[PDB]
Symmetry: C4
Subunit: 52 residues, 4 copies
Amino acid sequence: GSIINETADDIVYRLTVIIDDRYESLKNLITLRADRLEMIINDNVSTILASI
Amino acid sequence: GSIINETADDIVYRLTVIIDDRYESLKNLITLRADRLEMIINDNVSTILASI
Amino acid sequence: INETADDIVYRLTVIIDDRYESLKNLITLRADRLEMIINDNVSTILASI
Amino acid sequence: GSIINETADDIVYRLTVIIDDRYESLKNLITLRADRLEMIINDNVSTILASI
């Protein structure tokens, strides 16, 4: 494409990679922490039920 | 010509779509995990209360 | 050309900030709600035995 | 090296800084709230188990 069109594509591409990377990191963190909370709750409930 | 202005507007438009799409995905994920935890907590507490 | 770059950066910063604030508010509100639900349920359990 | 490439690099760099800052802030908030939830759940479960 033209010089200006190619440059626009470059800017959008580069920032999309940055945005996607940060997005994936936050997604993974939220999933990890929520998954751990469910794991803890599951184990604790089992312990409570076994104790009374 | 007006191509620089139009290209700037296009860059902002394209990246707005990306930014908003990732935002919506995170918003939905956080809401889903929160709802899941609330349900798990309420269900488990009901079980506990009925067991003793 | 410098003014165009500034305009692009400003406009996208405004949008990024808007979505950031919304996520911050969501996380805070949902976390606060979960803490309340956990404590309320625990209070019921303790008062039950 | 050119003004066109320097401009693109400028836009990408400046917005990357903004994106990174917001990302770190959200990361820290998620970590803080998840840590609090684990503490509250642990505290409460220990209280329940010590009470019966």
